[PDB]
Design a protein around this ligand. Structure first.
Ligand SMILES: O=P(O)(O)C(Nc1nc(-c2ccccc2)nc2sccc12)P(=O)(O)O
Lengths: 286, 267
């Protein structure tokens, strides 16, 4: 009886997923699933399949935030400590990477040859995104609004696209959604950026949790050479300086613009009341 | 100006990977197994590259995870490029490897890559688990972890080559034996070199001689005192023997025996 194996197997799986679970236990998953279902209104995909897609998509999302936190050197997330301050860097890297490959295992269960091709590209896309973020930081600068957007579409907005890409593989709906997907990607991220600041006498780096954020970008470019982001970064009571230059204003407008661009591109794809409810629910904070 | 900056970032992401490859000091090996597996060169080359890619990506992450200061005498990658870059290079490379495994155009090859990478992540799992709890594996737990890390990559490379062979005889037994053989051999080498604490010379890494010491100031002298070098020399002899045995079983392999002989010289 070598049950000492089974024990160490059961043990290691638990540990491997603890950082991942510390992040799932924050508020979140609720909305990213009202989304899938909504899109399925066009793509009419079987239920077993949609669940697997949603799980995979949620797996990558969370594992990526674990890493973003380490890379941006964040102290908090949604008010709590970041996972690596509690579990340590090693264990968190190990956990996030382990989840990516479990995401892979899981994609395989879809049992459709293009699924891995699609997964693989997204994962490469995502890391390139992280790369950009570290690049701007190594050069003591800050992206433009246009460059920020592009980074979002690659990172943790890009991921919808995988979700809907994989769904499409199981649908006869073959009209092109990439456009509407970009639009929602930017809309979710920027909403979030907005929400998180519009939320001490705190400085800007501290509120953004060391992350590039739409309102703080715009503010930095708005009063060849690099950007000297230290003034809008260590500017006391940010949630004012940001009222002052009017970035909260600009952002609200930017979101209103995208809200509307969505409703346009949605009608172009036939209409989808399920999703329009979801947009208008989501708009109500501006 | 977004597409230029995009390409530049893909050249950048590979820099920590290449730092590690350029370090001074597995390819007699691949051909040696190819003796049984009669693999198409083109497919072989792809397997070799995937294996190398995955192997060094994983060394990058191990060095972060073990907080190692050196590797073969050189500063570890993250001490030069920083943790964010290294995490970010190694993971990019792992998925470049998956991309490359897809060019094999065999559906079980993704199946296998996944299993092996899962197995590997569980191995580092235990490694970090033990370090985080102020503890040390016993001999059997160490042997087992090693088999999960290197049996992970070894097994991957031999598993892939076997998908492209009509040689279907079971090779895991020999691979476990070699997997232990190389690790423990390396542990023995690293330390036997000696003219000074132990987590320092092992470089954050759990090591066979030390582990055996631990379950009975200066480290190289302490291991002499308890006869760990002694014990490990025996343990390696037992392993070499066992390998010669498991090779005869599989039809023999002059090239592989020649290699095991070259490696054993130092014990
Ligand atoms: O069934 P086979 O012995 O031809 C196969 N070997 C191969 N399968 C495949 C393969 C490719 C796509 C789908 C299924 C098998 N390709 C190749 S190329 C050289 C060998 C080989 P397996 O992996 O089951 O031993």
């Amino acid at each position: 009886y070598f049950q000492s194996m089974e024990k160490t197997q059961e043990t290691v799986q638990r540990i491997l997923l603890e950082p991942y679970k510390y992040l799932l236990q924050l508020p979140g998953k609720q909305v990213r699933t009202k989304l899938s279902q909504a899109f399925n209104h066009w793509l009419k995909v079987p239920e077993d399949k949609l669940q697997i897609i949603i799980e995979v998509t949620e797996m990558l999302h969370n594992a990526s935030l674990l890493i973003d936190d380490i890379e941006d050197n964040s102290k908090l997330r949604r008010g709590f400590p970041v996972a690596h301050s509690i579990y340590g860097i090693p264990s968190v890297i190990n956990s996030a990477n382990y989840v990516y490959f479990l995401g892979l295992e899981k994609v395989l269960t879809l049992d459709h040859p293009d699924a891995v091709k699609l997964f693989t590209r997204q994962l490469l896309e995502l890391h390139q995104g992280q790369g950009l973020d570290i690049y701007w930081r190594d050069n003591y600068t800050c992206p433009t609004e246009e460059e920020y957007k592009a980074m979002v579409l690659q990172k943790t907005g890009g991921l919808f696209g995988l979700a809907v890409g994989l769904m499409q593989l199981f649908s006869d709906y073959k009209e092109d959604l990439k456009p509407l997907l970009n639009t929602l990607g930017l809309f979710f991220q920027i909403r979030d950026d907005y929400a998180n600041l519009h939320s001490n006498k705190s400085f800007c780096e501290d509120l953004t949790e060391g992350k590039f954020s739409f309102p703080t970008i715009h503010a930095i470019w708005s009063r060849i050479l690099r950007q000297r982001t230290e003034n809008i970064d260590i500017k006391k009571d940010c949630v004012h300086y940001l009222e002052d230059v009017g970035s909260f204003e600009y952002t609200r407008n930017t979101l209103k613009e995208l809200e509307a661009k969505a409703y346009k591109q949605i009608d172009a794809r036939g209409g989808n009341p399920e999703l329009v409810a979801l947009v208008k629910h989501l708009s109500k904070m501006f």
